[PDB]
Amino acid sequence: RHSMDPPTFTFNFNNEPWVRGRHETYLCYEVERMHNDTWVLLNQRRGFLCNQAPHKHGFLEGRHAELCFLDVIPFWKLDLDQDYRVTCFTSWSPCFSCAQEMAKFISKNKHVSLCIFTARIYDDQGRCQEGLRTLAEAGAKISIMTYSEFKHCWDTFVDHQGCPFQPWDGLDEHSQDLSGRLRAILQN
Ligand SMILES: [Zn+2]
Numbered sequence: 064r065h066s067m068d069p070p071t072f073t074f075n076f077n078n079e080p081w082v083r084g085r086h087e088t089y090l091c092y093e094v095e096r097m098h099n100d101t102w103v104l105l106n107q108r109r110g111f112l113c114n115q116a117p118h119k120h121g122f123l124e125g126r127h128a129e130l131c132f133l134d135v136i137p138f139w140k141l142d143l144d145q146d147y148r149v150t151c152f153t154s155w156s157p158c159f160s161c162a163q164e165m166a167k168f169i170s171k172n173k174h175v176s177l178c179i180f181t182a183r184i185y186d187d188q189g190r191c192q193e194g195l196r197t198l199a200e201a202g203a204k205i206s207i208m209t210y211s212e213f214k215h216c217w218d219t220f221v222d223h224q225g226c227p228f229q230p231w232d233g234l235d236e237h238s239q240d241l242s243g244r245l246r247a248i249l250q251n
Contacts, residue, residue, distance in 0.1 A: 066222040068222055069222065078231075079237055085183075087114055088155045090129070090153045092151050093109040094147055108139055114128040115131060128153070129158075130161060133168050148175075152181075153182065155183050155185035158185060
């Protein structure tokens with residue numbers, strides 16, 4: 064929940080587009096509160112999670128990372144008189160059904176500005192495009208992770224033991240390509 068191991072981060076967040084065995088989704092989150100025109104980090108409200116695989120003693124049919132994330136928000140007991148920026152850094156973007164659920168949540172929770180930075184776009188069998196547009200329309204800010212966000216997530220969410228962020232090959236190129244794709248998706 065607090066700290067991810069380096070192999071897990073590197074395997075999952077590498078932004079080359081191919082699935083290459085990345086069947087899980089990892090989601091890192093942090094929360095900031097608005098104070099005098101500035102965002103203030105809430106240190107106790109940062110963490111990471113992944114999707115839950117089907118389990119007899121968990122969720123019988125599993126639970127996507129995005130739903131696990133929405134599940135935690137009410138437990139933060141955010142002050143409804145304040146304004147928050149909730150930022151997610153995700154290894155894959157949401158499936159269509161999750162995008163719809165996240166859109167519903169944010170529409171009901173206007174004290175929260177949701178910002179999503181994604182390493183890759185999950186096609187969801189052609190369903191992803193409408194989902195992302197729906198999420199944007201509801202007020203989410205959707206962006207592609209670039210070097211600075213990967214480095215941030217490494218520095219903040221990984222048990223690096225002092226090892227610096229080492230970019231994988233093609234990081235900038237994959238990010239640029241994906242940024243083009245997202246522009247095309249969001250402009251319909
Ligand atoms: Zn989903």
